[PDB]
From a paper:
Our results suggested that three conserved residues (D8, T11 and D221 of SePSK) play an important role in SePSK function. Using enzymatic activity assays, we found that all of these mutants exhibit much lower activity of ATP hydrolysis after adding D-ribulose than that of wild type, indicating the possibility that these three residues are involved in the catalytic process of phosphorylation D-ribulose and are vital for the function of SePSK. Three conserved residues in SePSK were identified to be essential for this function.
The At2g21370 gene product from Arabidopsis thaliana, xylulose kinase-1 (AtXK-1), whose mature form contains 436 amino acids, is located in the chloroplast (ChloroP 1.1 Server). SePSK and AtXK-1 display a sequence identity of 44.9%, and belong to the ribulokinase-like carbohydrate kinases, a sub-family of FGGY family carbohydrate kinases. Domain I exhibits a ribonuclease H-like folding pattern, and is responsible for the substrate binding, while domain II possesses an actin-like ATPase domain that binds cofactor ATP.
Numbering used by the authors: 2 to 421
Write the structure that this text describes.
Amino acid sequence: VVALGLDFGTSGARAIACDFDSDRSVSVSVTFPKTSQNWPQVWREALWQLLTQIPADWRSRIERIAIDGTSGTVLLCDREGQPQTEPLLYNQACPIDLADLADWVPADHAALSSTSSLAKLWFWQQQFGALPPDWQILAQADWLSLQLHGCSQQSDYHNALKLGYSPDRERFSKNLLDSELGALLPVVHEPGVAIGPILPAIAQEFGLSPDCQICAGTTASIAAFLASGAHQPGEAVTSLGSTIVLKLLSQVAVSDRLTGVYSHKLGGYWLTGGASNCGGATLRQFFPDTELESLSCQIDPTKKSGLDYYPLPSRGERFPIADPDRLPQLEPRPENPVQFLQGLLEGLTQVETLGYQRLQDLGATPLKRIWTAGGGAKNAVWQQLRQQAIGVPIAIAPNTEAAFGTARLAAFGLAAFHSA
């Protein structure tokens, strides 16, 4: 099978045409401006550019296409999919009372944030006063795929989660559907399934096969996990980027609203996770990547440093333990930079450890393996500390690109996430 994965990030977009029969692949990229007063147009043009940069002999063999977008970015469009107002982005919060959403979701739902799609929809509702039933609200991936198949009000239960969708019971609440917001909600499918055939004009214009299928998309955070290929409960992906992001595959959904922990549905399994403010950003505050490696090469992990740090970049922690007043603990400081770096890495290691432990304490499936992603993944000393502190096999993930995971999503769907 030859599938195309489309990843739409925060600062740009990457496309990966992957060909799983050989295996061979080709990747292309576009970078967004940092400012614009017409983001949908930018996204659309980015889509066409991505399609254009892909070689013809590749486009003529693409069978299935999938699109992942940023979780939280939404658009308000009419019945034809034309943006009526300018999008509300993933980072933008809304000045509304969450108590207004209490009757539409359980009292622990992930949609109960000031950044969630439901909150943004309520905000738009109290700007416009009364949103027409003719209209629709669409996630970025929803809209971008709408550019490909033309079927309106279609979505997956990854992006719909923060819109108020209940993946546990495969539905929206009856109160939400009975409300004045119910008409704008999309039909929710499973990520990977084929929504419909590609538009004939589009296929003609880009030399694509008219029998090509556009599948239901997902989020970038999940597509990144899908790139690893982990499908057994207990398997986890740890992202050692600027901030440490933990993702654990479990047989049971967990949730802790205080720490921002919630679970996505993934086939017959669940994908839980968390995000700490600690990470590689704290490391580059004291060392450039220049000195970082040259100092890490002098660290023997099999002996403790005697240091006990909590490597926060600034005031406030979110996960595993939530306290918005916790100061960074980076004392005492030995003059030997090696042991200081070791202390930092030990701190981060403890962050990851306590994270996974808390995830297990919330009811998630016991940890079995670790697949590491991010810049810190190639750090073998850090890997040693991590394995010493956790006690499970840790290795570098074969792939980390979200577009590739989206390609695997288009080609195979969420089939592997069952036990049959």
